[PDB]
Amino acid sequence: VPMHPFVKALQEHFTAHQNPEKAEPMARYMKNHFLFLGIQTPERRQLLKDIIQIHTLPDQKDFQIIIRELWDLPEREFQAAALDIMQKYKKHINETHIPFLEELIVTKSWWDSVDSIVPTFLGDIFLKHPELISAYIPKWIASDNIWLQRAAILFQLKYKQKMDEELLFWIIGQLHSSKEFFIQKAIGWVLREYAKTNPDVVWEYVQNNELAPLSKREAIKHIKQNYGINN
DNA sequence: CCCGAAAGTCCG
DNA sequence: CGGACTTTCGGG
């Protein structure tokens, strides 16, 4: 069965505007894990907009199908476009889509896709259905997959006052010994971000609990100004 | 415009 | 390590 015509149209239109010269450093920026067409975000969004203006957005019944097909295409701009498109179907996404989102996190995985999926899409779902957190987070933490572990750390990134502190610190405690850069950095990020809401709690945490040096210094990047740096 | 963030390199 | 910088993107 052929590619969805929307996807085919997107693929034709992107490919006609490819830039091999830009593609090389863009691919190097992602450690050469992916082929790139060499289209940066402002143009990529306009090209998508063009295809929607002509073909209209596919019926929601094809939403997951479109995302999968784009996900399977080799160049990274198609996963970036897939995430743009998924945003346009946001009001159709609910708790039943968590396994679908899991699957996106663990395929073609890198910080660009996972960071675009987790604090927004998964974050919003677990905010509305916090009782579902325990059906997924422990599995993610225990998995061999560092991107699921990073998802467990970052899904609360934007929660601000809705942050479950006990949960956040429990998750960090489970992952604080990881030697993985993307885990240490995620821990640093989520603490740095939460410190913008509750600096005292983050400060007390990092001064009294083991963290990778990277995690700690990223966490207190800003709030160290408020407490000072002891001799 | 600005700032802060993911990364990234380069250097001691 | 960790700081200083390159850098694209999102969000005032």
Token reading at A186: 């995620």
Q: Which of A172, A159, A58, A77 shows the shortest CA–CA distance to A118?
A: A159
Helices (H) and strands (E) in chain A, counts: 15, 0
Instruction: Write the CB contacts of A231 (distance below 8 Å, at least 6 apart in sequence).
Output: none
The alpha carbon torsion through A61, A64, A69, A72 (nearest 10 deg) reads: -170
Cβ-count burial A55-72 (b if 16+ within 10 Å, e if not): eeebeeeebbebbbbbbe
Angstrom distance (rounded) from CA A108 to CA A72: 8
Longest dimension (CA), chain A: 68
A218, closest nucleotide (Cα–C1'): C2
The alpha carbon torsion through A122, A158, A213, A201 (nearest 10 deg) reads: -120
Q: Which of residues 12-51 of A touch strand B (CB under 7 A)?
A: 28-29, 31
Q: Strand B closer than 7 Å to the CB of A186?
A: yes
**What is the CA A227 to C1' C7 distance in angstroms?**
31
Q: Which amino acid is at A98?
A: I
Angstrom distance (rounded) from CA A178 to CA A115: 19
Q: Strand C closer than 7 Å to the CB of A217?
A: yes
A39, closest nucleotide (Cα–C1'): C8
Q: Which of residues 54-93 of A touch strand B (CB under 7 A)?
A: none
Q: Which of A45, A84, A53, A54 shows the shortest CA–CA distance to A66?
A: A84
Q: Which of residues 1-60 of A touch strand C (CB under 7 A)?
A: 40-42
Q: Is A33 exposed, middle or buried (0-12, 13-18, 19+ CB in 10 A)?
A: exposed
This PDB structure is determined at a resolution in Å of 1.9
- Write down the domain spans for chain A: 1-231
CATH fold, domain A1-231, is: Leucine-rich Repeat Variant (1.25.10)
